[PDB]
């Protein structure tokens, strides 16, 4: 509350560390469905169904330009990528499986870097 604060967690490295995580997600062999925005002209249904499209290149541009206020807003966009994937793709599909694999890969790096 006013003039009452928990001890200050060092967040000075969060930007660099999120960048590193994102580099590792970008270079994963199963990243290919997530590297670029879904083409809304060429994928019937995507535009109407997926209210907030997100992909790794959009996260990279947001990160690089100071559009994440803190490390939690960064994680929310990474998770959005996978939530969107589950919304649109059957579990038993190459893309469906890719999304599960990448979400697992992310969540471990996230816990190991920050928890």
What residues contact 35, with CB distance under 8 A and at least 6 apart?
26, 55, 56, 57
Distance CA 19, CA 15 (A): 6
Segment (H or E) for 103: helix 94-114
Under a CB-based contact definition with an 8 Å cutoff, are residues 35 and 61 in contact? no
| Structure token digits, residue 52 | 């907030």
For the chain, domain boundaries: 1-115
Elucidation technique: X-ray
| DSSP line for 38-65 | --TTTSTTHHHH-SS---HHHHHHHHHT
Per-residue CA distances from 23 to 10, 16, 56, 57, 59 (Å)? 22, 11, 9, 11, 11
Distance of alpha carbon 90 from alpha carbon 94, whole angstroms:
9
Tokens 């694999």 appear where?
A: 101
Helices then strands, each counted (H, E), the chain: 5, 0
Helical packing angle, 71-88 and 56-64, nearest 10°: 160
Say if domain 1-115 classifies as CATH 3.30.70.360. no
């Amino acid at each position: 509350s006013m003039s009452v604060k928990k001890p200050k967690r060092d967040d000075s490295k969060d930007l660099a560390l999120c960048s590193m995580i994102l580099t590792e997600m970008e270079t994963h062999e199963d990243a290919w469905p997530f590297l670029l925005p879904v083409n809304l002209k060429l994928v019937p249904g995507y535009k109407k169904v997926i209210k907030k499209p997100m992909d790794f290149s959009t996260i990279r541009e947001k990160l690089s330009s100071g559009q994440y206020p803190n490390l939690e807003t960064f994680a929310l966009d990474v998770r959005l990528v996978f939530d969107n994937c589950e919304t649109f793709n059957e579990d038993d599909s190459d893309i469906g499986r890719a999304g599960h694999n990448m979400r697992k890969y992310f969540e471990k790096k996230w816990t190991d870097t920050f928890k």
